[PDB]
Amino acid sequence: MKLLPESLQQEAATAAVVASWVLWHLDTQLLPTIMREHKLHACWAAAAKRYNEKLFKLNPSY
Amino acid sequence: SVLAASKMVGAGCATIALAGVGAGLGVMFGSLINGAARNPNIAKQLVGYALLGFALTESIALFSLLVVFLILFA
Amino acid sequence: EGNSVAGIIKSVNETSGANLLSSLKTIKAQAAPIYPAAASSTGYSTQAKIALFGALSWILYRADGQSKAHEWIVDLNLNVLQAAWLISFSSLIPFRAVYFAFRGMAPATASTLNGLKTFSSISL
Amino acid sequence: SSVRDVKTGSLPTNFLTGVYRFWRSQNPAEKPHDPVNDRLLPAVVDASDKRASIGTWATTFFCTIISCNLLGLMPFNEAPTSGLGFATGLGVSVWATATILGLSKTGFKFPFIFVPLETISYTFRAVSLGVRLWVNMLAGHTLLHILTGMALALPFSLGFFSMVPATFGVCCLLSALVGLEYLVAVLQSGVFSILSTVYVGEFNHDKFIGPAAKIVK
Amino acid sequence: TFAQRLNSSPAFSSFLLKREKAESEVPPSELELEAAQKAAELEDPEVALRTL
Amino acid sequence: PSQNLVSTFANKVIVEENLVNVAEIDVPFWSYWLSSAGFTSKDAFVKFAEAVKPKVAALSTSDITNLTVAFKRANYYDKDLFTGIEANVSANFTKFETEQLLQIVATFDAFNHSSVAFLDDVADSITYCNHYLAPVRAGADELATLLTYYAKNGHERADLLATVARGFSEVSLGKLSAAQRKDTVLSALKAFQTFGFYPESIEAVIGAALVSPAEYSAEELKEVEAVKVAAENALGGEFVLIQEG
Amino acid sequence: MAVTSFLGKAFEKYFYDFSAYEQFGLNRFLSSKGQYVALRHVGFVMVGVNVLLAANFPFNPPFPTIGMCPAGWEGTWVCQADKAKALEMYKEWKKS
Amino acid sequence: EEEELWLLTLTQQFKHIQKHFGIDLPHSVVAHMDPLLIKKIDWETTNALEDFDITLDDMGAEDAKEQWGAENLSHHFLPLIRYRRDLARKNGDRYGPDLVNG
Amino acid sequence: VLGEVYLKDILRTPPTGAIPANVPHPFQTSFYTYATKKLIPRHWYLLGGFTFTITLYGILDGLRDSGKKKAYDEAIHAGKTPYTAGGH
Amino acid sequence: MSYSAYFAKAGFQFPAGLSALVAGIVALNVCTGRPTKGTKEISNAEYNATPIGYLQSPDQHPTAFPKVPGMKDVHGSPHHH
């Protein structure tokens, strides 16, 4: 049993590579998709009242 | 091999700090039970504090164990 | 691919009065969204076969290195102790409740879409 | 150059939405004194520009650390986190990220014997953040290996199918230990990211460039 | 209903959710069931014209 | 004998004609990067304009704003080309982003080129087709260029004014230098007085002239005070400065 | 004709339908289903460690014995604590 | 039936989204049906404002959250706005909402 | 009437012909846009932290190699073996 | 109907930039600068001089399922000082 590895810098660079890939994949592939779903639902839920009142005012059918 | 003998003796004397950290951790978890009994409406908040508290408390155990490793396998 | 409602309008205006009630179902089926039917079941993907063969090669390589190791038998028994928990998680975890809990984690799936109402966008 | 199609409402999307909203909620934005409207909206957008992305960073660290921590519990696998350089490199990385943010706030200027004592107390966060998670992963694997040898010894020196109750008891103890290792894997990933959020939120505070001139009524 | 649409979703075709039903987690209301019946009745457009 | 050879190779192959003849494949790309590197010669851009002129109407939005910025830097105005660019912008205005439209409107404001349909499509694209915080990321000189463009052409669009008034604040005006801030404040206040539109964010313009009135002359201060009194009457109160606290 | 389709359907039928808690009628011996899951977990561990030890044996264990042998190797080449001595004793035991 | 295409396409698009959204709707069908909403959403992720509705919740800004949602779906009224503006242009008048004093 | 040309790229119906391709984010398209728009302006603190930890661990590897080479040098100068051979 | 068959059409797919992740981990594990663990960079004359079994140290070839802990598969260099 050894505490230290063969190279501390190699393991540190492995951690940096893995975490930087998780950062790029999060910011680039995951967070656009997440925010497309979330901001569609949130924009509709935040604008339902104003949207329906504006469309009710525009609608000449009544 | 008097150095390795003292390594075994020193690691066995080194892990005494786990007693104090276990007594403190049990005090903190018993207070978590108490604080959930006082006000359960915020209980899922309190457990979070407990975990965070356990977190920092656990670190005092690991700085013990690290010294044990620094005694045993350095 | 044009507007489907514009196709509904053109197809309804293009029919005669005698043909309208007969052709309403076909005008409905023409401007209805494509839900693509199930294709023929094929082989596994290139990436799926790469994943399975790479997982098997990693498992074999790690089991070989665990055999070569100094405390080899406790390595091969740690594998049994971990596979036991992977077995017991398939039996313990309430996967329907876990699915709906994760659905509650995101606000997009926690509630229904509250958006356009019918009375605002009606056209008499 | 063509991206893949995603089903809306998938379980990984919902899980990562909840995780991101959690680590984003750890450092909430401050309410301004003025009401938020179009006069205050560039001040709000610049406040969000000056705030560091601790939600993205904490989600990054949570996902990578829980992935390595759970890799430690798959068969034929050890955690990368149980390595010293990996876990303590992540810890020194979070401490240096917080320090680089706090230095850049102070104009890239480095910071009455209270200042070296607080310097050592702050500098020990670099040791503690990585050594905690690394020590927990190393201790759990080491404890399992020592415990497994004792369990193996019981049926090696008492017959394969000749000692059922003691072998059953020690395998119950080993199985409860592996369940504890699952709990410790999840907990230490969450602890690393919570302490990451508090360490960077010590320096996340910035000036709100609000309105300097207004119509009073 | 929303539960029937969840049962027809891909997520309930996956292996860990083959035998599960979404009604057992949250059942549909009486309004939701009668509105699913009413919408199935009004899926014929000629019936909708006559009804209106 | 290599020096006579390199003198023969240096005056016949590496010339401006082969430079503008290799720049025919992707001409908004090449005109953009050659104009940024500093190559602003007239005859090359005369060649470049008839290079793009067929294929303008099917260009991308990034290539349109690249070509328009390049011809802004070369200062060469081709009426049929900018009619083609204006028709491209008016054709697919929903695809254009606000920063691209601000660069395009800056080029169309350097010359006096405008249609009614182009102005309505740019205002519709900035207002409706783009994010409402896109003027916040703009920089107040670009927005003041757009405001003076719409004021010069007399096109009144109150929704576009309410959109690009959002970009004027303490932040975006504080990003500018002092002369550029004075020019931007004068342009924005003149355009807002032309339109008769005094939003709640005009005061961040007015304050940017009144926190530092040392750079402003007396007639410019009279103009700023005229817009200040007009905004006081429109917004419904009196204009104070806020101190540090 | 396909192999992975039958493998998926067969593992589904084994995972979901095949239940030895009701097929063997273990509801009389055990209280609940979760107790059966815990005992099947620990029984999986016991059978696995016995198959590994039973698989390849007789060998000098790298894990610490508590001073107990397998009752057939008092001091041959399996219970030896020194490893080089156990190696040469294994060699003179393998020559036989 | 002067403007029934615009109202009926709004009804049909929202009915399909609301029918399929959290269940099985692909992202491609959403970006086909509402491309400008996806564009305005991508602007927030691009310009590091992907937590802007969380920021408006942290600041307690319910009016600004309503304005944010209404300004993201503001393009749904753009076909009607352009049609009525072209009608008023052919009649020779000005469009009412375009003017500051309208 | 309000034609289809007013609805051209603003507002579309659900697809009847085929399901289109997914519209990429600008970050999914190019790494240059991600790097210049979000990775460097927002995450340069994290990148500087990774750079600092790799630099610092290279320094620690240098110190460990210097101490190890020093021990090896005095071991071969003392005439003894620096390493234990062992038993195979 | 539903879009279930549309998603069943697409097979298993990797995370989008996983090839860059595996390339970075492999490039960290093979481009180290130092030689392979256990091995020593010797001269070309010494490499061409020695046979295969003498060049292999016994510490680098452990026995697969060793009956005794410390069994090595090869016995290298009986000719030594």
Ligand SMILES: [Zn+2]
């Ligand atoms: Zn292990």
